Point group: C2
Chain length 1223, copies 2
């Protein structure tokens, strides 16, 4: 016999992890010292030293990995060496050690906020094995919808992997999509802040969920239900419609047909759900001018109330009436042994079909085979096939509904049958023996031992009867070898179709789709092996479950709450209203999102250590699961080339408390239900360094009362108007009752009161009596509307019999707040100052006034201080230096911004030398990327060296890029002088732009793309490095441009021709067009910009025209400060790699503005002082520099003093909002 | 009638841990809202918002401890407030918050080094819940014994709570007790460095371990064994001696009588244990001038070699021949209900005596009572007493051997009976009921769920049959609440001596001495309770074991070491030689040492939050464990005054590695044994954040060969000076064989030709033959000395028969380095 060995490691090692390495020894050897090492550049760690035994032995050891010798990634070398008695086996492979993606998320308690609320949020960072990581954050930031950073917490440490942070939102905070970022990661937790009111009912479709083209009619069923679980009445309008399909060509036959649609009007039943049938004779399933799509817009208005809900459902019409997919089968067959599998058969309605005659056709080189099968009464079709006629050839399985396909017809869409296709490859079995694993149905549970049966046959032609046989099994989860073992079997049985069993246990360390690989090496050297995948549900380490008792309980009294988790955990709990999830769907915190933030659905070898043998077997079996194998056994295929209750409450988020789980595993807390009659959806994620991360499914506590009231009233209420206060009184008791309703009159709202002063009415079971009022308000802010109802004892009978009072819940009151705003139209007066003392005190007196037409308590004024030139995304400027390229003409516009960002960063005080070196290395390898576009004439071209003389734009761009890169690296100026002779030859002094050269990409050279702009750029490119006017090229350029300077027109071109005269330093003709430039600029507050993508370019060129010119004054300083404040919020000003030239010109405008006037703050103490001797102090040093701080001032608006002391420049913006009478 | 509440907190909160808090409520309430909250000097978190229920309910929640506003230690306050329906209950009590003690130990691979070797050491931090912390180490330092810091490490980060560091000692490093110190703290580890040679055998006493005065003559059974488990023949000289005791007055009568020594010479038997009786009347037991403490110094010399091993056994001589101690009993007793207890019965050797009539006498105000009791065949005396006639008065119990004590005599030392004395206090019981907890044996077993039987009697005069009575139980360990429960019983059973059971689980969170408190509040206002103290062995939550397979190996063959700990744990190793432990005894790394690393007085409040009266009940039951109680029930009494291989090897440690544990909880490694004929003692500890710290027993591997050699030679050799190299040959084969010996000649050393060749000889079973040579050194430094022995087949009989050649063990080649100095 020949002894063998097999060592297996993960191919992709992870740095804070503990991994396994397995080594299997044949019998024989038994005198050879085996040792395995992994060699990094820092050490040589031996994994195991070992010797052979008299039997086959599989030995697996765990190890802490070496750190990577690079920054975060290093190719280490795995080495097996067997020494001893004049033989030295040595084999050598490469593995990869990298710091894996520590995935994080941020969970706000709500996706929605009124202004004045409190944004609570938890940031969780967690490992690939769902272990929490206490890698403490540098910074976390909360930014406006204007991308302006308004909150920042620095150097924050998490407890048990999670951190909670509370930001009190402003009562005057602007409406939009706020964002929260951590450490400048890939996670941007966004929440909306807007004005909203809570809907009390959800409308949804029920029966239209699938539609096929073979149906005749479908029954639209629209169910509207309250949040507390009761049905309701109300008028229903359902718009069922198919829109016209927009074709892939958008220029011809664009005059479309109108959308085909039918509108349903109705009333819901006693179960509160309206049903009506709609034919598909209305819609055009045959026609390609209409999409295969039906929009259902269901709109329900409550009876006598006026509130409205809508459901927007999208249905995709499918001509496919049945789906047949392989789901439990292998991609490989062993030769001349039976092959097993099963087919999932489903219909159009994704339901498990019954008693279907499926037909399996087999394509092979011997002959086409056909076999029919019948599904069972569960929806599966098992099959076993005899492969002995397949002759070791790759075959094809096709499961079909019928033998004959549908003939394509003009009058009807051909209904396609989704067949079951499979390709079977012969396994590389050099020795005749068989393994097979019986697969385990659908999704498998976790924490319980799965019993898996393994079938085998060891033939007595390659294994002698004295040789003990053993099967080595590996369970691989998420690309790491997570379970190992070997089973020894008795050698006396030898040749029979036998079986044995394994007892596995799937968990969160196991994948959603993990693998089982079993193998057996014979003493002949051949191996027989089989692997299967698995369907494992998205489980977790902590078995968390949430429990309410008694789970449907009256509003205002206690409910016991159970947390089930692993002991020693710290667990976070969110109990929130249903109604706040009715407007915006919540940010999905589930098992699928936690499993989805780690991108490892592929497994496999990485790019760094991949083995390209090609110019299936056991090596492919370990390659597909992501394990490096080193062996001398025949595992490689040879390569081939081819009782009154007062009710004020907490209707928003209810529970946001942290609970550490004790040693019992379970923990209870009694919580008091808020008085809003809704459903509370609660969820919890528990985390622990012991077991891991666990996530409860969300549960619901239905707070419900039998008899109650409900006020409805809008949120956006202005003063003076009479709004519709609608009070819907609900009786859900089974007996008819009498109610008495009264609004408690106070001195804070006015009405003339239809049916007030303790009105009385009669109602009965499932009844909603809607009283109406219109109310006008006199106060401001939040004011309370209070109502009370009682069930009177019936002196007279009504509704038939005498009314009956319940013993409990006889009375019900309600207090509801509303926000009332001042009258008139709003208008803002803003004033900005750039206070820059240089080691001193700089002061400014600000005066802001108001016309005398104001209603009282309407004027508000607040001041904002900012220490930085722009809001956020300095790390975007850090990331602009990456991603080199050499394809297309986007390479020059991606290699342009490096010199600009390293000019910008050194004047901001945050320059780093390692990105300096990396960026100039990228620029030095980027100098070679413009060399194969060099023309044969001695110039550059857009594409090819034979196209012709190049365009002036690209030659001027590479002239600027070569002349502005001499401050960082060595660029020779000989190519500039080689280009200048072709600038002189291309444009005549008698006439400029003789039209030689063309760009490959259109709408790219500018916003206008005319000849005078390209001429002014190529004649402005010479003197923009620091040169004066000394050349014939710039002389003929100014000769061409001085005629157009007096011609005016097209202010973009006027600004960029004022740019070259500002480079010339002359004030004679650019001042006669400067006055018509700034007066045509529109005003957007203090963030103004010039208006004629094109406007941002015009703003950048006019900022450099106003900045490059000499004699900068303070009004020009404030004007340019307003311009760069508008450019601060432009996300297209920086962040584009294949974008236009706007990015580099706005970025060099930022660089020149940091050069000349505004340098960033490093120590500013600011004080504001008012008329009424009120003062306030801001501190802006280095980390609250970007924090855009606010302060609300209580004085009557007048003259105020704004003083800045220290070293640095600061920006102060004062905003006065007030309301004026419309006449 | 009158509703009652009870709030329980630990009285000493540790900052990185979580703590329980408990609230128990009577039937009644259901309209008030109880808030318990813990305020400190920066924040106030609401521990429980909680409305009342119509039954009795026990609700307990776990909370994170607030940070210390004082920096490391502060006095917070917990308060209870029941507000609602114009009812305002408000009470408060002070509690202490301090940072928990970070324990730290350092181990080394050996406790003893020659200069020129590598010193390894591991330093481990530890919490009071035995979980390791990866706290940032500032600096660690290594000091010469002249108080000079010779090595220095700055800014070392722990990997899974431990640090593993190495240092190369100098080849001319001077001799003394070097010290490893951490951050100028209280932790230090001393290792001695001097020249040594490894002893191959040890010697200890077997039979003399206790001396009582009633003996006539006592056996001295000295016994000497090799490290590889085999007996040895030799010459034994034992000095058994009684020293003259120095007087307490150190000013007069300096003339001292000579020490009563007896010298015994002997040869060990085939089992290698020398036994000889010594008449103990030679030693002066009566007089005070001679000490009551014998000292046995035994020196054993191997024949033909000259090496010697000494053992010093210091045995106290005691006149005590027995001990009555109370160990399973309560300090309290309930009035007019039976009281149970158990007595340990031990003799002069502290062994369990059989069939001893122990006598219980009871000292009370009604009358002194006597009772006799027969022990079982285990060593226990279980008794029960009626307390109906005791009338609620504190009593005393005394358990004795006999009624009459021994008369003091001038001619004899008065031998004392160590009786069992106890004082029983009356329980403060306002309402008549009984609650007793049955005891559980001696030291309990960790991890297994024990079953405890608790019996009770609820008197129907002070209870109502319609309402149920629920017993609340607290299983408390190491000053914090561990396990909780509320177990109800219906009062339809009425008044009887009923019983029920609890399923307890004891872990490392629970103490070596944890407590169990069971109580109940009746609606009259009274309370009934019982507290017992358990006894658990010094346990760890991480159960770790080591196994060598096949646990006895010839040198040169691999051995599978199996290491069994929790998954996700990082484990140390130490496979030291036994011969290293024979020179310097190891500093103790055991469960006693780890549990004694932390102060374990406990059972009381801190002095900053202590409560005292002007001058037992449930409040004393919670004081004696150290828990704060806020209650309005009758919980306080009214105030009153109170074949051929060459053997070069590893005479240092064999295994010193870090093996993390995978998910199966098992690890294994085939480790190659070193080529010394010895025993390797291996021990490991594992640190995990999940299951904490775990420490394994010291398992042993006997690396043994049947036929081998050994070289006796000193460490230091003066160059140009002759020494005696003594090579001994051991035959442990069962037959008689013929050996042949060749000492390798080289230019590194010179020989004087003493039995140069033809040293072939006959060695029978369990035999040793020593050959001496006169060898001098010629060159400086380390010198190899090589000996090769083999078995030759010859027709010349050895012992009357031809020497049978082995199949394994035919030859043995040994290489020993030696140090040569000028």
């Amino acid at each position: 016999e020949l002894p063998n060995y097999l060592v297996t490691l993960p191919a992709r090692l992870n740095f804070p992890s503990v991994q396994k390495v397995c080594l299997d020894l044949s019998p024989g050897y038994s005198d050879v010292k085996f040792t395995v090492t992994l060699e990094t550049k820092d050490k040589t760690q031996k994994l195991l030293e070992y010797s052979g035994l008299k039997k086959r032995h599989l030995h697996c050891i765990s190890f802490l990995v070496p750190p990577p010798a690079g920054g975060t990634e290093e190719v280490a070398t795995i080495r097996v060496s067997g020494v001893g008695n004049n033989i030295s086996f040595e084999e050598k492979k490469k593995v990869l050690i990298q710091r894996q993606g520590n995935g994080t998320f941020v969970q706000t308690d709500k996706p929605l906020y009124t202004p004045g609320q409190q944004v609570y949020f938890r940031i969780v960072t967690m490992d690939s094995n769902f272990v929490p990581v206490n890698d403490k954050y540098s910074m976390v930031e909360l930014q406006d919808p204007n991308s302006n950073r308004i909150a920042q917490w620095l150097e924050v440490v998490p407890e048990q992997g999670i951190v909670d942070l509370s930001f009190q939102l402003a009562p005057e905070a602007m409406l939009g999509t706020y964002t929260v970022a951590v450490a400048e990661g890939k996670t941007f937790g966004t929440f909306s802040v807007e004005e909203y009111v809570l809907p009390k009912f959800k409308v949804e479709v029920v029966e239209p969920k699938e539609l096929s083209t073979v149906q005749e009619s479908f029954l639209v069923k629209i169910c509207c239900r309250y949040t507390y679980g009761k049905p309701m009445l109300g008028a229903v309008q359902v718009s069922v419609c198919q829109k016209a399909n927009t074709y892939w060509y958008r220029e011809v036959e664009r005059e479309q047909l109108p959308d085909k649609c039918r509108n349903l009007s109705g009333q819901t039943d006693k179960t509160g759900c309206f049903s009506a049938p709609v034919d598909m004779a209305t819609f055009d399933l045959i026609g390609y001018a209409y999409s295969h799509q039906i929009n259902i817009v269901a709109t329900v208005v409550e009876e006598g109330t006026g509130v409205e809900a809508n459901a927007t459902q999208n249905i995709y019409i499918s001509p496919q009436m049945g789906s047949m997919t392989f789901e439990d089968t292998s991609n490989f067959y062993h030769p001349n042994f039976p092959f097993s599998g099963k087919i999932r058969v489903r219909g159009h309605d994704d339901s498990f079909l019954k008693n279907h005659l499926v037909f399996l056709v087999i394509y092979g080189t011997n002959g086409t085979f056909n076999q029919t099968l019948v599904t069972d009464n569960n929806g599966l079709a098992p099959f076993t096939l005899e492969t002995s006629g397949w002759n070791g050839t790759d075959v094809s399985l096709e499961g079909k509904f019928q033998m004959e396909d549908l003939v394509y017809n003009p009058e009807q869409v051909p209904r396609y049958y989704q067949n079951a296709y499979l390709h079977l490859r012969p396994f590389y079995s050099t020795t005749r023996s068989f393994l097979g694993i019986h697969r385990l149905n659908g999704p498998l549970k976790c924490g319980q031992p799965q019993e898996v049966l393994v079938d085998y046959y060891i033939d007595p032609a390659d294994a002698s009867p004295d040789q003990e046989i053993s099967f080595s099994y590996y369970l691989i989860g998420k690309g790491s070898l997570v379970m190992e073992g070997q089973k020894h079997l008795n050698s006396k049985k030898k040749g029979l179709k036998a079986s044995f069993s394994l007892s596995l246990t799937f968990t969160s360390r196991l994948a959603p789709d993990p693998s089982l690989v079993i193998y057996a090496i014979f003493p002949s050297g051949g191996v027989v092996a089989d692997k299967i995948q698995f369907s494992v549900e998205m489980c977790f380490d902590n078995q968390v479950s949430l429990g309410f008792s008694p789970s449907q309980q009256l509003p205002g009294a206690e409910v016991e709450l159970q947390l089930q988790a692993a002991p020693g955990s710290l667990c976070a709990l969110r109990a929130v209203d249903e109604s706040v999830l009715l407007l915006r769907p919540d940010r999905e915190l589930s098992n699928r999102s936690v499993y989805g933030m780690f991108p490892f659905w592929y497994g496999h070898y990485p790019y760094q250590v991949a083995e390209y043998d090609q110019c299936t077997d056991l090596f492919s079996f370990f390659r597909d699961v992501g394990l490096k194998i080193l062996s001398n056994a025949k595992i490689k295929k040879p390569v081939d080339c081819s009782d009154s209750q007062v009710r004020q409450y907490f209707p928003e988020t209810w529970l946001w408390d942290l609970f550490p789980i004790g040693n019992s595993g379970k923990e209870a807390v009694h919580v008091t239900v808020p008085d809003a009659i809704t459903e509370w959806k609660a969820m919890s994620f528990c985390t622990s360094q012991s077991r891991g991360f666990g996530l409860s499914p969300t549960v619901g506590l239905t707070a419900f009362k039998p008899f109650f009231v409900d006020l409805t009233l809008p949120y956006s209420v202005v003063r003076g108007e009479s709004f519709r206060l609608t009070a819907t009184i609900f009786n859900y008791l089974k007996d008819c009752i009498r109610v008495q309703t009264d609004l408690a009159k106070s001195h804070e709202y006015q009405l003339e009161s239809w049916a007030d002063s303790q009105t009385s009415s009669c109602l009965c079971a499932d009844d909603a009596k809607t009283h109406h009022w219109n109310i006008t308000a006199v106060k401001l802010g939040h004011i309370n509307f209070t109502i009370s109802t009682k069930i009177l004892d019936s002196n007279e009978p009504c509704g038939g019999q005498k009314g009956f009072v319940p013993q409990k819940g006889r009375s019900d009151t309600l207090i509801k707040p509303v926000l009332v705003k001042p009258e008139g139209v709003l208008v803002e007066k803003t004033h900005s100052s750039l206070l820059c003392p240089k080691g001193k005190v700089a002061s400014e007196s600000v005066s802001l006034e108001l016309p005398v037409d104001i209603v009282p308590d309407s004027t508000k004024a607040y001041v904002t201080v900012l220490g930085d030139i722009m809001g956020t995304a300095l790390q975007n400027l850090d990331g602009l230096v990456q991603m080199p390229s050499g394809c297309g003409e986007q390479n020059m516009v991606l290699f342009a911004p490096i010199i600009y960002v390293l000019q910008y960063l050194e004047k901001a005080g945050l320059l780093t030398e390692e990105i300096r070196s990396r960026a100039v290395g990228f620029l030095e390898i980027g100098y070679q990327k413009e060399l194969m576009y060099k023309h044969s004439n001695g110039s550059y071209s857009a594409f090819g060296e034979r196209d012709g003389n190049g365009n002036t734009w690209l030659t001027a761009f590479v002239t600027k890029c070569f002349g502005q890169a001499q401050k960082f690296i060595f660029i020779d100026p000989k190519n500039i002088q080689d280009a200048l002779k072709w600038m002189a030859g291309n444009q005549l002094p008698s006439g400029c732009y003789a039209n030689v050269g063309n760009l490959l990409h259109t709408a790219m050279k500018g916003g206008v793309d005319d000849e005078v702009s390209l001429t002014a750029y190529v004649t402005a490119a010479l003197l923009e490095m620091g040169k004066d006017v000394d050349d014939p090229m710039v002389s003929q350029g100014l000769r061409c441009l001085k005629n157009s300077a007096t011609s005016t027109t097209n202010l973009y071109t006027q600004a960029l021709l004022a740019y070259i005269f500002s480079l010339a330093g002359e004030m004679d003709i650019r001042n006669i067009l400067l006055k018509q430039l700034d007066q045509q600029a529109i005003i957007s507050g203090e963030s103004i910009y010039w208006s004629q993508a094109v406007d941002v370019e015009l703003t950048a060129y006019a900022l450099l025209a106003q900045l490059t010119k000499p004699s900068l004054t303070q009004k020009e300083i404030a004007k340019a400060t307003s311009i760069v404040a508008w450019l601060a919020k432009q996300h297209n000003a920086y962040g584009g790699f294949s974008s236009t030239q706007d990015t580099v010109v706005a970025l060099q405008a930022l660089a020149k503005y940091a050069t000349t006037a505004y340098m960033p703050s490093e120590e500013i103490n600011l004080v504001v002082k008012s008329t009424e001797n009120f003062q306030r102090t801001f501190n802006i040093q280095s980390v609250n520099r970007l924090v855009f701080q606010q302060d609300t001032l209580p004085n009557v608006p007048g003259m105020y003093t704004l003083e800045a002391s220290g070293q640095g420049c600061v920006y102060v913006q004062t905003v006065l909002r007030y309301n004026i009478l419309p006449p």
